[PDB]
Design a protein around this ligand. Structure first.
Ligand code: ANP
Ligand code: ANP
Ligand code: MG
Ligand code: MG
Lengths: 490, 484
């Protein structure tokens, strides 16, 4: 997997932090390098100008209702709190579709005009169900009647109960009523003709239902079952509105996922000062800023591959930015080809590469017989076998992991093989014969990361044409190595 | 990665955890870490290894993870009948494990598992009150079955009286039947409404049946009150010996970790290596390498030598070998046996450091990830430090990296550290043969088969053989030809 070597999912995860739901999160994970990304980029470019013009678009209610949609598809009825979620999400779909028709943005308009209006469903839910989740009296007249009769009956028992309390103050432990039954004391149990239900943990209370309370409690309990039965009919009738338009609802959920993936990419562009770069025939970075470096630390990278060139060998000091710069070419190419905007300045150009390959990093596994040399070389054999004119190749620390005289000879032959095959390559190295082969070969270009002599530090500037060295002693000193060991080394 | 992670230590501990009887031993195996005095831990493994070959597997039935039942007691809550049976079978598994070790000749086993306190009374009180299926027997208490005798005798009586009421009151009954609902006998009386309670033809409960159906409800709630009285009296038997109980759960966890280590050594042909004064691997087999693929490793650090410099072919085993010295040392100090031969010697090192590269955009490069660790190791290396340095000097130009590798090795040798390194830089190789504290080693390569053999050749330096190994991994011959 070459995208992982170029930190591709780490940058997508940065974009996913702006998604308004886990719908766009899942859809962003579907965006991978394609040969024809123009439609995806123009959609990002359209919503980008939208933000600059009219600000953030309407987004209230655009939550992840994937679970609720499956429950309807499964045939089950939705709970009142689920119908509220689906409704506020469907009303959000209505506002989003409407808002994209009064504006100038074409591709946004034709794409999300495919949303399905559920204005009928949103009205029934807002009429039957209130904000806290209860069923409103306005739902059905039948429920309205049962509640009135249940309240009228419950007001009678509570009046009769307070009469039983004031008149039977000698048989009651606590002078009250419970749950509708009475806390009568045992021993004084057979005093009132009634039905025994529950006993106290010490055998003191006999929680009894008096004679004149049995049929009344039963009438109230039937009214409650009537209320429960009517609510289940109200919820079924509401969920059926969604069941009858299941395809319309599932299309609304995918379109919000797509819009959410576009919404996250646009807000990523404004935080990082992004630019929508489209496939060109040149590779030029203009003040490119790696999204994984903090803004306070990042130094923009300027690089341009001349048209008469095919390879870029990068040398320079340790921690000078050789690998990061080589990563930015592969990453930004894979990002544009996926449909993402790029943290760079206007004028940046990149080129569609059907084959993007990278050899970055070393893996040590005993199980996979993986060694420093083996993990690199097993990728090299992969790349060499499939490198052609459509291939862009990123080779990090070519020739490292073995005898320097043999690694530098392997490094030069591999570069030669990719060049003959018509591949575009970006290479880091710290071996001298590789630097020499780069300036001897007319298809190769040498560049180095800048090193400040007075400050003994890297400046992260790309100097084209000049090779550079590792400066290992000054970097080891900055990394904390004792001055004793270094003065010894020099 | 920390030092133990660089040596695949937790990956190996994961192998032994597969042999545990329960999560009691899996959790305890996660606590075993390199200690300076591992003698008792290793002697217990050896004694249990002796027991296995002598008497077979020890008694193990009932030694499940009952940690949750022990915590429920801690919270004062009473335990359900099935929880009573789980704990009762664990404690019985403790009494059979104790009695088995006391009749043997393994001191540290008996002595350690003597602190096992047996709950013979709790086992007998659970087996008498609780039945195997989870029901409450009648011997549980004299009141329990007096209630059940009166409940059974009453239940047969109301039903007989219900049938009599139907047959003797047909004139007032809509249909000849009785209704049972919510534990009450109900009768379909016509408008000719017999005194009693009407539960919503009128469904009527005659006054005779009101007091009788009541008595049914009282006796059923009295049974529930008595079973909880017993479930609490049962739980409290353990609470009076809760310290004995929690000690019993740890002692079984310690046994389970021993049981797992013995089963691991028994399966990998393991040897209990104890601390010595020297380092010598006699046919060491790295446990992460498949059994039908590993080649045993032989290696020995001479007593006048404190640095092992391993060179040789790419994919030749330089790293895994030097890793094996560090891993087998850490495992030994943690109480584990080792896949090696009788004769292997390892030495206790209170400080174990390793270097085996991270690449992260918060200032970690190839050179940085290594050198950031080196500065940490140099800062803390002393006379009892075992230091493992993989690919020392890589990540820079060959010239300065070689001068940095030599200065670090000799700075660490001066501190008194024992050091195992891998390298492929010629100046480091030459430094190893000219310095009195250094020894040069190399992994063998077969020229005919053009493949490494993973045999340690001591005394001579070696070579990477990149061209041949790149050929064995598939790189086209024309690239290799252009390289040579
Ligand atoms: N353009 C940049 N602006 C700011 N910081 C940067 C830039 N490029 C790199 N860095 C930082 O510097 C570090 C050096 O990264 P890296 O590219 O691996 O150096 P390197 O040249 O590869 N060192 P090495 O591979 O060991 O020879 C990165 O991890 C970032 O933290
Ligand atoms: N004794 C052994 N028996 C069997 N397989 C082994 C043995 N030692 C090593 N291997 C295998 O060989 C692989 C290479 O080992 P490794 O120690 O990484 O070589 P290396 O010398 O470090 N190569 P490099 O570091 O890139 O120069 C390991 O991942 C194992 O799969
Ligand atoms: Mg690097
Ligand atoms: Mg290695």
């Amino acid at each position: 997997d070459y995208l992982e070597s170029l930190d591709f999912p780490k940058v997508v995860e940065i974009v996913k932090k702006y998604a308004l739901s886990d719908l766009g999160r899942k859809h962003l994970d579907t965006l991978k390098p394609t040969v024809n990304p123009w439609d995806e980029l123009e959609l990002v470019e359209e919503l980008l100008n939208y933000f600059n013009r009219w600000g953030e678009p309407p987004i209230k209610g655009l939550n992840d209702i994937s679970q609720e949609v499956e429950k309807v598809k499964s045939g089950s009825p939705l709970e009142p709190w689920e119908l509220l979620r689906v409704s506020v999400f469907l009303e959000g779909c209505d506002i989003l579709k409407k808002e994209f028709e009064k504006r100038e943005y074409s591709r946004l308009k034709e794409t999300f005009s495919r949303l399905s209006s559920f204005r009928e469903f949103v009205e029934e839910v807002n009429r039957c169900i209130e904000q806290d989740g209860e069923i409103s009296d306005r739902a059905s007249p039948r429920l309205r009647e049962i509640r009135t009769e249940k309240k009228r009956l419950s007001s009678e028992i509570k009046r009769k109960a307070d009469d039983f309390v004031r008149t039977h103050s000698q048989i009651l432990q606590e002078q009250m009523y419970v749950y509708y039954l009475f806390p009568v004391k045992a021993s004084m149990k057979n005093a009132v003709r009634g039905i025994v239900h529950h006993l106290s943990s010490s055998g003191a209370t006999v929680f009894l239902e008096p004679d004149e309370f049995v049929e009344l409690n039963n009438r109230v309990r039937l009214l409650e079952e009537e209320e429960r039965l009517e609510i289940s009919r109200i919820l079924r009738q509401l969920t059926n509105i969604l069941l009858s338009r299941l395809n319309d609802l599932e299309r609304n959920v995918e379109l919000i996922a797509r819009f959410d993936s576009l919404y996250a990419r646009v807000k990523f562009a404004r935080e990082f000062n992004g630019t929508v770069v489209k496939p060109s025939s040149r590779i030029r970075l203009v003040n490119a800023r790696h999204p994984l470096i903090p803004k306070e630390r990042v130094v923009p990278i300027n690089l341009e591959l001349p048209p008469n060139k095919r390879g870029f060998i990068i040398t320079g000091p340790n921690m000078g930015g050789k690998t990061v710069t080589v990563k930015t070419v592969g990453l930004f190419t894979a990002l544009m080809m996926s449909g993402f905007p790029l943290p760079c300045d206007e004028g940046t150009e990149l080129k569609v590469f059907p084959k993007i390959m990278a050899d970055i990093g070393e893996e040590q596994s005993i199980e996979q017989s993986l060694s420093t040399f083996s993990s690199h070389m097993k990728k090299i054999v992969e790349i060499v076998k499939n490198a052609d004119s459509d291939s862009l190749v990123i080779l990090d620390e070519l020739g490292s992991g073995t005898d320097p005289v043999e690694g530098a000879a392997l490094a030069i032959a591999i570069i030669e093989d990719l060049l003959e095959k018509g591949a575009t390559i970006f290479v880091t190295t710290h071996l001298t014969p590789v630097k020499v082969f780069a300036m001897n070969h007319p298809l190769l270009l040498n560049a180095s990361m800048e090193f400040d002599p007075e400050t003994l530090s890297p400046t992260y500037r790309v100097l084209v044409g000049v090779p550079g060295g590792s400066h290992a002693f000054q970097i080891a000193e900055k990394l904390g190595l004792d001055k004793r060991i270094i003065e010894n080394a020099r």
